[PDB]
Amino acid sequence: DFLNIPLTIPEMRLPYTIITTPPLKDFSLWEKTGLKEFLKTTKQSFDL
Amino acid sequence: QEFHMKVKHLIDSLIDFLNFPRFQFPGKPGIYTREELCTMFIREVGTV
């Protein structure tokens, strides 16, 4: 469930350079990448 | 003369390029600019 959380990443600045990383609004790796839809789940639960 | 012009312009650009970025350390909360962090380090070194 922590992966489904849309973490809001701000716009920081990398040291020793002028490259400014774009902010990431509502970043959910489990969902934005599309894995939630493919696996049709939000967690892992396997029984063997 | 052209070389001196290029050199002085490069120095002027480098001053901004060096005073532009900031820093963010885990032990020091918040983002510290170049001059503020430099002054804090000067004060800590001086008092120690």
The amino acid occupying position B7 is V
A43, two tokens: 């967690």
d(CA A2, CA A24): 16
Q: Does the distance separating the beta carbons of B24 and A15 come in below 8 Å?
A: yes
Q: Does the distance separating the beta carbons of B20 and A15 come in below 8 Å?
A: no
CA distances from B45 to A38, A44, B33 (A): 56, 51, 18
> 3-state SS of chain A?
CCCCCCEEECCCECCCCCCECCCEEEECHHHHCCHHHHCCCCCCCCCC
Which residue in A has a C-alpha nearest to residue B33's C-alpha? A15
- Give Cβ neighbours of residue B40 (< 8 Å, ≥ 6 apart): B32
d(CA A19, CA B19): 14
Which residue in A has a C-alpha nearest to residue B22's C-alpha? A15
Pick A18's closest partner by Cβ from B17, B23, B24. Answer: B17
The 10 Å Cβ neighbour count of residue A20 is 11
CA distances from A36 to A5, A7, A20, A40, A47 (A): 12, 16, 30, 5, 19
What are residue B23's phi and psi, to 5 degrees?
Answer: -140, 160
CB distance B32 to B23 below 8 Å = yes
The 10 Å Cβ neighbour count of residue A30 is 19
CB distance B21 to A15 below 8 Å = yes
